[PDB]
Amino acid sequence: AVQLHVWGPAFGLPSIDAECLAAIAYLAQTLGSADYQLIQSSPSAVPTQHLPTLYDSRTSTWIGGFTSITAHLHAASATADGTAYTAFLSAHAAPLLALSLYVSSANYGAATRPAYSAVLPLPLPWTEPPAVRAAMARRAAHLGLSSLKSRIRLEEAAREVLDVLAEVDWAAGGRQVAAEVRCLAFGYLALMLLPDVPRPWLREIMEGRYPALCTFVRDFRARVFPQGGKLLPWADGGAQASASASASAVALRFVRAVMAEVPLVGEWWSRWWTARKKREVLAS
């Protein structure tokens, strides 16, 4: 009776972020429709504040992150490569993702902002997508590229990642990896391919140069995510009515975020809040 908290169904992938989509694929391949619940949520609706979060009903513990979630629910060069790529996708690949859909303004404002505003309550989109863009842009450093013949640098910063991810043999070959790192690749290689954006420079690179990835990302979704991934055991209310357990609470989500923005006492108020919230995790 595990209980995961994920983002919304926005772009045809039952999630809008790589971590939670990866966790959803893992759970859907491993556990079964009668074990989890997928309570769609928001980062300010959980003690961990790191949204892809398992809540184990048996002992009532919050487990943040995808790696830590995989810590539960479970030659050696195989697992060596598994750890290597699982550490190479959380960085040098999340920034390449965040370069689109989170930094490029011509793309952030036509598909991602409606995505967020269509999965939260009414007053929340006024504050949270700003924080999400801020985080994904801060992680989008260490690349030197910004909101931009100034595109050969872009294609090179994309090859420096897709070339490493290319020789994996994600689906069969080269070097079979694992059942928890594969479901992580499809977590990133989906939001880098599938979205319908108005400023595409990530699709054609992979579709035009890397066929081994195009087939996997298309074959994988054809395996566990048929017809948009609604067959997953969502909450009882439905896709949109999933976030029903939390108008009273939504106000508290609003005041907490906006109060952390006053100039001087804001920072200290935030540090008092997350320090109080975290001590609920260890106690759990």
């Binding site: 504040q49 697992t79 490569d81 750890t83 790529y85 040098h92 490493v164």
Partner: protein, 282 residues
């Protein structure tokens, strides 16, 4: 115009503090060392600098080492170099961290395009292992004494300033760890999360134990005592930059990675880099 300067005399005899430090005869690498072990040339204690110093000592460059303080630098990062001074009032331009191997010159092995596979492991070193060094040094009260003995005491020596520095360090260390998704991608403000509670000392530490298990597994496949090569390259020096500072100062994990691969490898880099030294192992 005209010839107005009627007498031009000799140069003006630079001050005292700029004759003892910057006299110069050898290229002078500026690292995070201490004055007692900066003359003997012992390794630094800041891994982002021990990496470059190890590369240079592998580059067969004979040079000096002088401590510094992270503000005197062409860029933000410290380990720059300053070529020897040619005339007592004029010096060549510094050399930023990136070009230390461009100035050090068969030195092609230390800077090569790594195979597409080992470029994936370098994430373990620079992102998984680097966070365990930040989380365990700065944001652990056990090492409150150690951090104080290295990064602040030789800075200001005035208890109202050491504390102002110490707080600006941990506010910076807790930031660079709270961003890499090993510890936490917690979303809390349109501001970075710089606090020892925006992360978790469990997730960061558990990945580091998994890192040193993957790295130790790569070395057993090499059968040439180094990571798939013949002589120490840019990948051996990057792991030794962390597998040492965590052993000289997490320590039982290195010596227990696999069967002793990372502990033995470190003791075989201090046979190629520091051949006459003794006194490691804490």
């Amino acid at each position: 115009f005209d010839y107005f300067p009627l007498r031009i005399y000799e140069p003006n005899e630079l001050p005292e503090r700029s004759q003892q430090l910057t006299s110069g005869d050898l290229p002078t690498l500026y690292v995070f060392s201490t004055d007692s072990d900066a003359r003997l040339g012992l390794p630094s204690f800041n891994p982002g600098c021990l990496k470059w110093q190890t590369l240079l000592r592998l580059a067969n460059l004979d040079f000096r080492i002088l401590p510094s303080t992270n503000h005197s630098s062409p860029t933000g990062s410290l380990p720059f170099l300053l070529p020897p001074r040619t005339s007592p009032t004029a010096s060549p331009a510094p050399i930023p961290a990136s070009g230390l191997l461009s100035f050090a010159r068969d030195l092609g092995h230390l800077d090569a395009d790594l195979p597409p596979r080992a470029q994936a492991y370098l994430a373990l070193i620079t992102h998984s292992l680097r966070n365990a060094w930040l989380c365990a040094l700065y944001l652990d009260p056990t090492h409150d004494a150690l951090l104080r003995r290295l990064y602040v005491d030789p800075a200001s020596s005035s208890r109202a300033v050491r504390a102002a520095l110490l707080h600006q360090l941990r506010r910076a260390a807790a930031e660079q760890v709270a961003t890499a998704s090993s510890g936490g991608g917690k979303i809390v403000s349109l501001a970075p999360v710089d606090s020892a509670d925006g992360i978790d000392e469990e997730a960061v530490y558990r990945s580091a134990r998994d890192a040193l298990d993957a790295l130790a597994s790569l070395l057993r496949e090499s059968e040439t005592a180094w990571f798939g090569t013949e002589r120490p390259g840019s990948f051996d020096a990057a792991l030794f930059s962390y597998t040492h500072l965590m052993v000289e100062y997490l320590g039982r994990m290195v010596k227990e990675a696999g069967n002793g691969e990372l502990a033995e490898h470190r003791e075989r880099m201090l046979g190629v880099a520091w051949p006459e030294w003794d006194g490691y192992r804490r």
